Tab-separated table of C-alpha atoms in Angstrom:
chain	number	residue	atom	x	y	z
X	1	UNK	CA	126.482	82.397	86.040
X	2	UNK	CA	128.356	81.665	89.243
X	3	UNK	CA	128.217	78.562	91.548
X	4	UNK	CA	128.263	80.702	94.607
X	5	UNK	CA	125.473	83.375	92.885
X	6	UNK	CA	123.477	81.026	92.394
X	7	UNK	CA	123.538	79.168	95.944
X	8	UNK	CA	122.791	83.148	97.174
X	9	UNK	CA	119.905	83.819	94.836
X	10	UNK	CA	118.677	80.103	95.496
X	11	UNK	CA	118.944	81.445	99.285
X	12	UNK	CA	116.923	84.744	99.023
X	13	UNK	CA	114.460	82.215	97.048
X	14	UNK	CA	114.441	79.535	100.516
X	15	UNK	CA	113.972	82.661	102.806
X	16	UNK	CA	111.133	84.236	100.977
X	17	UNK	CA	108.362	81.117	101.687
X	18	UNK	CA	108.516	82.725	105.418
X	19	UNK	CA	109.893	86.773	105.462
X	20	UNK	CA	108.560	89.414	102.936
X	21	UNK	CA	112.382	91.030	102.950
X	22	UNK	CA	114.865	88.070	103.626
X	23	UNK	CA	117.821	89.320	105.873
X	24	UNK	CA	121.198	89.207	104.929
X	25	UNK	CA	121.918	87.108	108.388
X	26	UNK	CA	118.893	84.506	106.849
X	27	UNK	CA	120.986	84.365	103.057
X	28	UNK	CA	124.345	83.607	104.809
X	29	UNK	CA	123.448	80.067	106.965
X	30	UNK	CA	121.057	79.136	103.958
X	31	UNK	CA	123.776	79.939	101.210
X	32	UNK	CA	126.476	78.432	103.276
X	33	UNK	CA	129.441	79.380	101.390
X	34	UNK	CA	132.495	78.245	103.358
X	35	UNK	CA	134.602	80.983	103.387
X	36	UNK	CA	132.330	83.756	102.858
X	37	UNK	CA	131.812	86.468	100.163
X	38	UNK	CA	127.988	86.714	100.965
X	39	UNK	CA	127.799	90.019	100.683
X	40	UNK	CA	129.814	90.678	98.139
X	41	UNK	CA	127.641	88.657	96.134
X	42	UNK	CA	124.644	90.282	96.664
X	43	UNK	CA	125.857	93.025	95.671
X	44	UNK	CA	126.605	91.389	91.884
X	45	UNK	CA	123.065	90.397	91.959
X	46	UNK	CA	121.341	93.436	93.054
X	47	UNK	CA	123.206	95.767	90.674
X	48	UNK	CA	122.188	92.933	87.939
X	49	UNK	CA	118.667	93.186	89.017
X	50	UNK	CA	117.779	89.975	90.220
X	51	UNK	CA	117.432	90.814	93.351
X	52	UNK	CA	116.570	94.473	95.552
X	53	UNK	CA	117.189	95.515	98.889
X	54	UNK	CA	113.795	96.604	100.443
X	55	UNK	CA	116.255	95.338	106.668
X	56	UNK	CA	116.820	92.484	103.907
X	57	UNK	CA	116.611	91.803	100.139
X	58	UNK	CA	114.146	90.262	98.070
X	59	UNK	CA	113.991	88.592	94.489
X	60	UNK	CA	113.184	90.235	91.763
X	61	UNK	CA	111.240	88.972	88.514
X	62	UNK	CA	114.285	89.162	86.499
X	63	UNK	CA	116.013	86.938	89.054
X	64	UNK	CA	112.517	84.709	89.506
X	65	UNK	CA	112.857	84.150	85.160
X	66	UNK	CA	116.595	83.302	86.378
X	67	UNK	CA	116.647	81.179	88.570
X	68	UNK	CA	113.543	79.115	86.612
X	69	UNK	CA	115.818	79.044	83.162
X	70	UNK	CA	118.357	77.723	85.178
X	71	UNK	CA	116.663	74.677	86.439
X	72	UNK	CA	114.727	74.044	82.768
X	73	UNK	CA	118.695	74.654	81.444
X	74	UNK	CA	120.035	71.956	84.701
X	75	UNK	CA	117.619	69.516	82.794
X	76	UNK	CA	118.766	69.813	79.205
X	77	UNK	CA	115.553	70.834	78.292
X	78	UNK	CA	116.182	74.660	77.724
X	79	UNK	CA	119.909	75.658	76.227
X	80	UNK	CA	119.334	79.150	73.940
X	81	UNK	CA	116.037	81.435	74.294
X	82	UNK	CA	114.678	83.295	71.842
X	83	UNK	CA	112.612	86.034	71.090
X	84	UNK	CA	109.280	87.207	72.964
X	85	UNK	CA	107.155	85.921	70.177
X	86	UNK	CA	103.577	86.389	71.762
X	87	UNK	CA	101.517	87.298	75.155
X	88	UNK	CA	99.100	84.723	76.943
X	89	UNK	CA	96.094	85.588	79.618
X	90	UNK	CA	98.699	86.195	82.400
X	91	UNK	CA	101.735	85.058	80.670
X	92	UNK	CA	104.611	86.047	78.112
X	93	UNK	CA	105.357	83.455	75.066
X	94	UNK	CA	109.299	83.138	74.456
X	95	UNK	CA	110.555	80.966	71.824
X	96	UNK	CA	113.454	78.403	72.748
X	97	UNK	CA	115.579	75.446	72.075
X	98	UNK	CA	117.459	72.623	73.745
X	99	UNK	CA	114.592	71.849	68.701
X	100	UNK	CA	112.392	74.939	69.014
X	101	UNK	CA	110.061	74.311	71.504
X	102	UNK	CA	107.702	77.683	73.485
X	103	UNK	CA	108.440	79.128	77.080
X	104	UNK	CA	105.302	80.450	79.267
X	105	UNK	CA	106.256	82.860	82.195
X	106	UNK	CA	103.298	82.717	84.013
X	107	UNK	CA	102.994	86.958	84.946
X	108	UNK	CA	99.973	88.150	87.856
X	109	UNK	CA	99.808	89.181	102.218
X	110	UNK	CA	100.477	86.396	99.799
X	111	UNK	CA	103.632	87.217	97.194
X	112	UNK	CA	102.491	86.984	93.412
X	113	UNK	CA	105.744	85.225	92.898
X	114	UNK	CA	104.214	81.729	94.452
X	115	UNK	CA	100.708	82.664	93.185
X	116	UNK	CA	102.052	82.604	89.521
X	117	UNK	CA	104.404	78.734	90.627
X	118	UNK	CA	100.845	77.463	91.192
X	119	UNK	CA	99.294	79.118	87.507
X	120	UNK	CA	102.091	77.346	86.035
X	121	UNK	CA	101.428	73.680	87.813
X	122	UNK	CA	97.730	74.086	87.035
X	123	UNK	CA	98.392	74.898	82.834
X	124	UNK	CA	100.996	71.651	83.450
X	125	UNK	CA	98.635	69.508	85.053
X	126	UNK	CA	95.233	70.320	82.900
X	127	UNK	CA	97.938	70.301	79.276
X	128	UNK	CA	99.069	66.878	80.833
X	129	UNK	CA	95.849	65.428	81.159
X	130	UNK	CA	93.825	66.801	78.028
X	131	UNK	CA	97.131	65.611	75.854
X	132	UNK	CA	96.954	62.386	77.144
X	133	UNK	CA	92.704	62.161	76.204
X	134	UNK	CA	94.454	62.735	73.015
X	135	UNK	CA	92.990	66.345	72.848
X	136	UNK	CA	94.017	68.804	69.947
X	137	UNK	CA	96.692	70.782	72.601
X	138	UNK	CA	100.532	71.470	72.875
X	139	UNK	CA	102.756	68.938	74.067
X	140	UNK	CA	104.260	69.997	77.533
X	141	UNK	CA	107.520	69.265	77.754
X	142	UNK	CA	108.141	70.007	81.818
X	143	UNK	CA	107.547	73.001	83.877
X	144	UNK	CA	109.776	74.460	86.868
X	145	UNK	CA	108.471	77.536	88.935
X	146	UNK	CA	106.073	80.092	87.251
X	147	UNK	CA	108.076	78.212	83.603
X	148	UNK	CA	106.003	75.913	81.224
X	149	UNK	CA	107.974	74.207	78.528
X	150	UNK	CA	106.095	73.406	75.561
X	151	UNK	CA	105.953	71.948	72.084
X	152	UNK	CA	106.096	75.175	69.877
X	153	UNK	CA	103.054	75.087	66.824
X	154	UNK	CA	103.965	76.260	63.703
X	155	UNK	CA	100.543	78.335	63.823
X	156	UNK	CA	98.797	82.196	64.283
X	157	UNK	CA	94.944	82.598	66.969
X	158	UNK	CA	92.507	81.832	64.514
X	159	UNK	CA	92.054	85.318	65.036
X	160	UNK	CA	94.486	86.566	63.030
X	161	UNK	CA	92.959	84.462	60.005
X	162	UNK	CA	91.160	86.295	57.796
X	163	UNK	CA	90.961	84.101	54.635
X	164	UNK	CA	90.861	80.510	55.223
X	165	UNK	CA	90.106	77.571	52.304
X	166	UNK	CA	87.444	75.708	54.055
X	167	UNK	CA	85.305	77.253	56.884
X	168	UNK	CA	83.135	74.398	56.943
X	169	UNK	CA	86.159	72.040	57.766
X	170	UNK	CA	87.672	74.557	60.488
X	171	UNK	CA	83.594	74.786	61.989
X	172	UNK	CA	83.238	71.329	62.754
X	173	UNK	CA	86.590	70.990	63.974
X	174	UNK	CA	85.539	73.726	66.157
X	175	UNK	CA	82.532	72.263	67.424
X	176	UNK	CA	83.646	68.817	67.857
X	177	UNK	CA	86.166	70.107	70.264
X	178	UNK	CA	83.671	71.410	72.512
X	179	UNK	CA	81.825	68.340	72.463
X	180	UNK	CA	84.814	65.913	72.750
X	181	UNK	CA	85.892	68.542	76.036
X	182	UNK	CA	82.005	67.586	77.337
X	183	UNK	CA	82.060	64.406	77.057
X	184	UNK	CA	84.869	64.339	79.155
X	185	UNK	CA	82.695	66.398	81.657
X	186	UNK	CA	84.338	69.728	81.277
X	187	UNK	CA	83.476	73.119	79.923
X	188	UNK	CA	86.773	75.389	77.997
X	189	UNK	CA	85.216	78.930	79.483
X	190	UNK	CA	86.720	80.938	77.469
X	191	UNK	CA	86.883	78.692	73.852
X	192	UNK	CA	87.073	81.635	71.573
X	193	UNK	CA	89.170	83.306	68.556
X	194	UNK	CA	92.283	83.896	70.727
X	195	UNK	CA	92.542	80.822	72.316
X	196	UNK	CA	92.787	78.509	69.161
X	197	UNK	CA	95.453	78.077	66.561
X	198	UNK	CA	95.163	77.161	62.983
X	199	UNK	CA	98.352	75.371	62.108
X	200	UNK	CA	99.081	75.394	57.620
X	201	UNK	CA	97.215	72.257	57.500
X	202	UNK	CA	93.932	74.305	59.186
X	203	UNK	CA	93.678	72.038	62.030
X	204	UNK	CA	92.858	73.922	65.577
X	205	UNK	CA	95.175	74.265	68.448
X	206	UNK	CA	93.700	74.992	71.571
X	207	UNK	CA	96.751	77.033	73.759
X	208	UNK	CA	94.639	78.703	76.737
X	209	UNK	CA	94.335	76.499	79.625
X	210	UNK	CA	91.877	78.580	82.572
X	211	UNK	CA	89.644	77.119	85.222
X	212	UNK	CA	87.071	74.475	83.003
X	213	UNK	CA	83.981	73.975	84.391
X	214	UNK	CA	82.640	70.513	85.019
X	215	UNK	CA	79.623	70.003	83.206
X	216	UNK	CA	77.900	68.590	86.694
X	217	UNK	CA	77.960	72.275	87.599
X	218	UNK	CA	74.422	73.984	88.312
X	219	UNK	CA	75.143	76.979	85.323
X	220	UNK	CA	76.894	74.140	83.016
X	221	UNK	CA	74.318	74.553	79.944
X	222	UNK	CA	74.891	78.123	79.845
X	223	UNK	CA	78.644	78.213	79.952
X	224	UNK	CA	78.293	75.649	76.939
X	225	UNK	CA	76.286	78.003	74.952
X	226	UNK	CA	78.339	80.996	75.358
X	227	UNK	CA	81.242	78.651	74.092
X	228	UNK	CA	79.046	76.843	70.807
X	229	UNK	CA	77.447	80.903	70.282
X	230	UNK	CA	81.169	82.280	70.177
X	231	UNK	CA	82.383	80.505	67.605
X	232	UNK	CA	78.849	81.118	65.840
X	233	UNK	CA	79.436	84.578	65.766
X	234	UNK	CA	83.279	84.734	64.898
X	235	UNK	CA	82.564	81.870	61.642
X	236	UNK	CA	79.325	83.971	60.554
X	237	UNK	CA	81.910	87.700	61.030
X	238	UNK	CA	84.468	86.806	59.968
X	239	UNK	CA	83.865	84.159	56.941
X	240	UNK	CA	80.092	84.871	56.964
X	241	UNK	CA	79.321	81.544	57.765
X	242	UNK	CA	76.282	79.438	59.305
X	243	UNK	CA	75.342	76.165	60.380
X	244	UNK	CA	71.828	74.666	61.271
X	245	UNK	CA	73.190	71.758	63.421
X	246	UNK	CA	75.108	73.312	65.893
X	247	UNK	CA	76.139	71.208	69.514
X	248	UNK	CA	73.266	71.351	72.867
X	249	UNK	CA	73.479	69.904	75.925
X	250	UNK	CA	71.569	67.750	74.483
X	251	UNK	CA	74.699	66.164	72.510
X	252	UNK	CA	76.741	65.256	76.197
N	1	UNK	CA	97.778	65.843	114.404
N	2	UNK	CA	97.850	62.090	112.631
N	3	UNK	CA	94.961	63.471	110.157
N	4	UNK	CA	98.185	66.118	109.039
N	5	UNK	CA	100.695	63.825	109.236
N	6	UNK	CA	98.959	62.109	106.471
N	7	UNK	CA	99.918	57.409	98.955
N	8	UNK	CA	101.503	57.717	102.882
N	9	UNK	CA	102.195	54.787	104.591
N	10	UNK	CA	101.280	54.227	107.995
N	11	UNK	CA	104.675	53.690	109.400
N	12	UNK	CA	105.296	57.169	107.885
N	13	UNK	CA	102.232	58.710	109.649
N	14	UNK	CA	103.523	57.223	113.030
N	15	UNK	CA	107.312	59.250	112.759
N	16	UNK	CA	105.592	62.654	112.133
N	17	UNK	CA	102.468	62.348	114.652
N	18	UNK	CA	105.245	61.025	117.250
N	19	UNK	CA	99.360	54.476	118.000
N	20	UNK	CA	98.122	51.669	115.780
N	21	UNK	CA	94.002	51.896	115.341
N	22	UNK	CA	93.378	55.463	114.674
N	23	UNK	CA	93.872	54.229	111.273
N	24	UNK	CA	89.846	53.121	110.933
N	25	UNK	CA	88.859	55.472	112.984
N	26	UNK	CA	88.589	58.121	110.219
N	27	UNK	CA	88.830	55.995	106.964
N	28	UNK	CA	85.587	54.504	109.093
N	29	UNK	CA	84.903	58.186	109.345
N	30	UNK	CA	85.632	59.294	105.813
N	31	UNK	CA	88.294	61.775	106.966
N	32	UNK	CA	91.765	59.289	104.700
N	33	UNK	CA	91.175	56.701	102.402
N	34	UNK	CA	93.085	54.222	101.089
N	35	UNK	CA	99.387	53.452	102.443
N	36	UNK	CA	96.989	55.649	103.164
N	37	UNK	CA	95.908	59.251	101.604
N	38	UNK	CA	94.201	62.103	102.385
N	39	UNK	CA	90.036	62.631	101.341
N	40	UNK	CA	88.302	65.918	100.239
N	41	UNK	CA	86.235	65.967	103.046
N	42	UNK	CA	89.283	64.690	105.596
N	43	UNK	CA	91.217	68.382	104.035
N	44	UNK	CA	87.752	70.398	104.743
N	45	UNK	CA	88.274	69.183	109.042
N	46	UNK	CA	91.750	70.201	108.969
N	47	UNK	CA	91.136	74.047	107.119
N	48	UNK	CA	87.325	74.329	109.493
N	49	UNK	CA	89.677	73.505	112.286
N	50	UNK	CA	92.695	75.825	112.023
N	51	UNK	CA	90.021	78.215	111.402
N	52	UNK	CA	88.632	77.655	114.509
N	53	UNK	CA	92.164	77.285	116.380
N	54	UNK	CA	92.248	81.350	115.267
N	55	UNK	CA	88.827	81.816	116.507
N	56	UNK	CA	87.201	82.761	113.154
N	57	UNK	CA	84.518	79.136	112.934
N	58	UNK	CA	83.236	78.134	115.688
N	59	UNK	CA	80.094	76.834	114.017
N	60	UNK	CA	79.099	74.062	111.038
N	61	UNK	CA	76.620	75.276	107.934
N	62	UNK	CA	74.271	74.455	105.648
N	63	UNK	CA	75.694	74.899	102.190
N	64	UNK	CA	73.966	78.337	100.443
N	65	UNK	CA	75.050	77.542	97.004
N	66	UNK	CA	77.877	76.719	94.285
N	67	UNK	CA	80.386	79.170	93.360
N	68	UNK	CA	81.913	78.571	89.810
N	69	UNK	CA	84.876	76.239	91.463
N	70	UNK	CA	84.221	76.340	95.098
N	71	UNK	CA	80.883	75.437	97.648
N	72	UNK	CA	79.461	78.453	99.954
N	73	UNK	CA	78.834	77.251	102.955
N	74	UNK	CA	77.144	79.613	106.424
N	75	UNK	CA	79.342	79.789	109.143
N	76	UNK	CA	79.170	81.738	112.478
N	77	UNK	CA	82.280	82.315	115.352
N	78	UNK	CA	82.212	82.201	119.244
N	79	UNK	CA	79.686	85.961	119.353
N	80	UNK	CA	77.427	84.444	116.896
N	81	UNK	CA	78.475	87.030	114.175
N	82	UNK	CA	77.401	84.743	110.944
N	83	UNK	CA	79.476	84.922	107.827
N	84	UNK	CA	80.306	83.682	104.482
N	85	UNK	CA	82.508	80.416	104.093
N	86	UNK	CA	84.186	79.178	100.269
N	87	UNK	CA	85.649	75.836	99.972
N	88	UNK	CA	87.588	75.804	96.920
N	89	UNK	CA	87.227	72.365	94.990
N	90	UNK	CA	89.610	71.998	91.396
N	91	UNK	CA	87.455	69.837	88.925
N	92	UNK	CA	96.111	68.454	92.937
N	93	UNK	CA	94.213	69.519	95.898
N	94	UNK	CA	97.215	72.203	97.217
N	95	UNK	CA	96.377	73.581	93.692
N	96	UNK	CA	92.963	75.052	95.253
N	97	UNK	CA	94.535	76.335	97.692
N	98	UNK	CA	96.066	78.793	94.931
N	99	UNK	CA	92.131	79.214	93.952
N	100	UNK	CA	91.775	80.318	97.595
N	101	UNK	CA	94.939	82.051	98.322
N	102	UNK	CA	94.463	84.370	95.018
N	103	UNK	CA	90.786	84.978	96.257
N	104	UNK	CA	91.753	86.455	98.770
N	105	UNK	CA	94.640	88.587	97.241
N	106	UNK	CA	92.047	89.784	95.094
N	107	UNK	CA	89.952	90.457	97.318
N	108	UNK	CA	92.352	92.115	100.131
N	109	UNK	CA	92.843	94.970	96.903
N	110	UNK	CA	89.541	95.429	95.745
N	111	UNK	CA	87.673	95.872	98.975
N	112	UNK	CA	90.670	98.448	100.410
N	113	UNK	CA	90.316	100.314	96.921
N	114	UNK	CA	86.063	100.901	98.011
N	115	UNK	CA	85.532	97.916	95.688
N	116	UNK	CA	81.194	96.302	96.356
N	117	UNK	CA	83.062	93.224	97.216
N	118	UNK	CA	82.039	90.984	100.618
N	119	UNK	CA	85.682	91.880	103.634
N	120	UNK	CA	87.795	89.320	103.633
N	121	UNK	CA	88.169	87.610	107.000
N	122	UNK	CA	90.828	85.366	106.192
N	123	UNK	CA	92.111	82.078	104.731
N	124	UNK	CA	93.623	79.081	105.209
N	125	UNK	CA	94.103	75.823	102.961
N	126	UNK	CA	91.070	75.911	100.092
N	127	UNK	CA	88.943	77.821	102.682
N	128	UNK	CA	88.394	81.692	102.481
N	129	UNK	CA	86.016	83.148	104.848
N	130	UNK	CA	84.613	86.066	104.498
N	131	UNK	CA	81.750	88.904	105.107
N	132	UNK	CA	77.883	87.500	104.667
N	133	UNK	CA	75.763	89.261	102.472
N	134	UNK	CA	72.338	89.315	102.927
N	135	UNK	CA	71.165	89.489	99.324
N	136	UNK	CA	70.434	86.489	96.524
N	137	UNK	CA	72.206	85.877	93.249
N	138	UNK	CA	70.653	88.541	90.732
N	139	UNK	CA	70.056	85.296	88.229
N	140	UNK	CA	67.313	84.324	90.764
N	141	UNK	CA	65.912	88.504	90.850
N	142	UNK	CA	62.874	88.376	87.983
N	143	UNK	CA	61.450	91.560	89.863
N	144	UNK	CA	63.492	94.611	90.359
N	145	UNK	CA	61.870	97.482	92.166
N	146	UNK	CA	64.078	100.130	89.934
N	147	UNK	CA	66.198	98.208	87.158
N	148	UNK	CA	67.422	101.736	86.561
N	149	UNK	CA	69.490	102.109	89.406
N	150	UNK	CA	70.425	98.423	89.105
N	151	UNK	CA	71.417	98.627	85.959
N	152	UNK	CA	73.645	101.879	86.179
N	153	UNK	CA	75.556	100.572	89.272
N	154	UNK	CA	76.590	97.765	87.559
N	155	UNK	CA	77.919	99.384	84.260
N	156	UNK	CA	80.129	101.992	86.764
N	157	UNK	CA	81.707	98.618	88.189
N	158	UNK	CA	82.292	97.550	84.939
N	159	UNK	CA	84.090	101.318	84.385
N	160	UNK	CA	85.058	101.576	88.043
N	161	UNK	CA	87.283	97.994	87.332
N	162	UNK	CA	88.579	99.520	84.186
N	163	UNK	CA	89.361	102.737	85.192
N	164	UNK	CA	91.960	100.475	87.567
N	165	UNK	CA	92.955	98.914	85.121
N	166	UNK	CA	91.178	95.467	85.845
N	167	UNK	CA	88.528	93.551	83.590
N	168	UNK	CA	86.670	90.984	85.109
N	169	UNK	CA	85.985	88.722	82.402
N	170	UNK	CA	82.927	86.318	84.022
N	171	UNK	CA	80.943	89.466	84.606
N	172	UNK	CA	76.999	87.925	84.684
N	173	UNK	CA	73.966	87.568	86.677
N	174	UNK	CA	75.612	84.492	88.775
N	175	UNK	CA	78.429	87.017	89.746
N	176	UNK	CA	76.792	89.657	91.884
N	177	UNK	CA	74.782	89.655	94.263
N	178	UNK	CA	71.647	91.814	94.987
N	179	UNK	CA	71.665	92.185	98.206
N	180	UNK	CA	68.038	94.169	100.787
N	181	UNK	CA	68.460	97.990	99.559
N	182	UNK	CA	69.417	97.003	95.857
N	183	UNK	CA	73.043	96.776	95.643
N	184	UNK	CA	75.128	94.841	93.947
N	185	UNK	CA	77.915	92.903	95.101
N	186	UNK	CA	80.512	90.667	93.374
N	187	UNK	CA	81.272	87.624	94.650
N	188	UNK	CA	83.917	85.867	91.884
N	189	UNK	CA	87.535	86.858	90.462
N	190	UNK	CA	88.426	83.852	88.949
N	191	UNK	CA	90.671	85.247	86.194
N	192	UNK	CA	90.968	89.385	85.696
N	193	UNK	CA	92.124	90.506	82.789
N	194	UNK	CA	94.306	93.705	82.289
N	195	UNK	CA	93.309	96.690	80.716
N	196	UNK	CA	97.216	97.052	78.655
N	197	UNK	CA	96.587	93.061	77.245
N	198	UNK	CA	95.919	93.645	73.659
N	199	UNK	CA	92.434	91.843	73.504
N	200	UNK	CA	91.522	93.500	76.380
N	201	UNK	CA	88.899	95.709	74.043
N	202	UNK	CA	86.917	92.456	73.837
N	203	UNK	CA	86.802	91.202	77.063
N	204	UNK	CA	85.718	94.635	78.400
N	205	UNK	CA	83.013	94.272	75.412
N	206	UNK	CA	81.512	91.101	76.723
N	207	UNK	CA	81.281	91.561	79.914
N	208	UNK	CA	79.062	95.361	78.994
N	209	UNK	CA	76.987	92.921	76.335
N	210	UNK	CA	76.337	90.377	79.315
N	211	UNK	CA	74.244	93.126	81.667
N	212	UNK	CA	72.428	94.590	78.688
N	213	UNK	CA	71.595	91.076	77.499
N	214	UNK	CA	70.264	90.101	80.465
N	215	UNK	CA	68.891	93.349	82.220
N	216	UNK	CA	66.630	92.897	78.505
N	217	UNK	CA	65.339	88.825	79.052
N	218	UNK	CA	64.809	89.537	82.664
N	219	UNK	CA	63.444	93.540	83.715
N	220	UNK	CA	63.309	94.394	79.736
N	221	UNK	CA	64.969	97.266	80.425
N	222	UNK	CA	67.365	98.961	77.990
N	223	UNK	CA	69.755	101.899	77.732
N	224	UNK	CA	71.210	104.328	75.588
N	225	UNK	CA	73.830	105.375	77.705
N	226	UNK	CA	76.126	102.075	78.350
N	227	UNK	CA	80.351	101.962	78.328
N	228	UNK	CA	82.944	101.786	75.574
N	229	UNK	CA	86.319	100.593	76.219
N	230	UNK	CA	87.774	103.892	74.616
N	231	UNK	CA	87.319	105.869	78.137
N	232	UNK	CA	89.923	103.196	79.525
């Protein structure tokens, strides 16, 4: 938590963009601690498992979470961290507060810490776009490194719901979402019971933002049919509901 | 250098590049557009020049196909050895550097563990250069000598990946290439799901059903034996 400890931790990350194993000598120069004590600071961090000595030092996964959280605390976004309230396709979902929000930490010669940095950016970019285009997605608050902070949704994934008031209403809302995305030139590619959250007012909200397929893509009709088939199957399997008029590529 | 220096004002470009009309020289060539920004065509040039500088890509190519979020071209080095160039197109630009690096990382790993994937040669920006496979995607194949051998090879691939702790997530007729000796080779790896994931059984079943469905619709082959998730 000390200002010196933070300078040294940021320097291990700084030198990591040119070195796999950052030498202690390189860390000293970036941290610029004035009256030294760099190697004493490096010893604390290793014991705290924020860095690992594998000759030099490398940043641990735990140390990367600390850097991202401190930066989001610095911006007045995350003040307290709650419990891990789930797992995404390649992420860890925690509950945060400044009210209450959702923190998504992305977990995947190139280093995977940097790849996670971009995976976060991609999610924030897709979320920022769709939200502005008035789509049922959680509001993106901010992002830093592998951390994405968004609106906390009071709901459970569709896959956990065994009894629903009206399945027809819920079905129509999922199919309208597939149409709305398609008319905006996008196909989800993973539109299913795990990526959709149903809230207290029984409204669908998409929470997974993978790599979305363009409608101009040669195999777009196949990906569109797969998403429509997924909803059709789940509703017929769980709530035993069937409909004759389902979206087709002709609707787009 | 001017292209590497490149909305960016002309005054800023001058300072990085270290004169004037050079500028409309590549605006006309559509390598940059209106301050001035880099075009998708200009980004391909930067990546190709760097791969030419490393003696990996010497000649141009005919776009032989399209990936889920990429453009597949044919390349050749000074020697004349033909390779496959994959330019990542996300539809930013710095994000296409992710999909490239991520693909190269997954390809490097899977190849080393002796998986049927094209050999990764090198990567830069949104460009990934790999081994050229003499084959067509399984979706273009309507007739095949033995459907049983091809089916077994696709199902063994699903098992082999699962026992390593990975689930493809998009294992289908577009991502698999069938060569002259009728051997399956994986050409896409966008988002692989871990077997330790809570919904891994659902993703594994989806891949297995997306081979059984295709092998019935085309070829009209069905086999009693097929992979189940409670095998690892």
